[PDB]
Amino acid sequence: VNSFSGYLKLTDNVYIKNADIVEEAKKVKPTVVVNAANVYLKHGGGVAGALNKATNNAMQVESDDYIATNGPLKVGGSCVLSGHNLAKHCLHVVGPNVNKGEDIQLLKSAYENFNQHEVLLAPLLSAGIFGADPIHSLRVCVDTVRTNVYLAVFDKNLYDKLVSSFL
Ligand SMILES: C[C@H]1CC[C@@](O)(CNc2ncnc3[nH]ccc23)CC1
């Protein structure tokens, strides 16, 4: 039993809710919140820009130190950093950004990072400003993640279409 509330159950291990991931994070304070990161951990917009704003830019400060030490992530890769005031940890995961021409096949590799964590709050990877079809992203999520994932979809209109079209 966990403290995630109001989710629709999609499969044995995947749950979905129309919600702002920022507001969800502050309520549950989960062990792991997933960020829709880029390889540079530049959290300017989308989910990343919103999460970073909620940390008063502390996420960006920590991220810049991480990159200065380690260099960029791989597309499809991830790193674990602090969750600041939102969660214990933030798993920064890089899905492909279609608006950069990046290979959508790497979306499965991106979701594989979730399997290293028993429970996660997460957005749909490569959705929103990353330009991929959120319906496809949901399919890859369900077919790749085996741990317990609670998916927050900000767009109420998008949430309804994802539910109604789910196979
Ligand atoms: C274009 C849509 C793509 C899918 C989204 O779910 C991604 N953005 C977010 N998702 C969840 N909490 C959030 N809080 C702030 C942003 C945000 C909603 C927008």
Ligand SMILES: [Cl-]
């Ligand atoms: Cl977005």
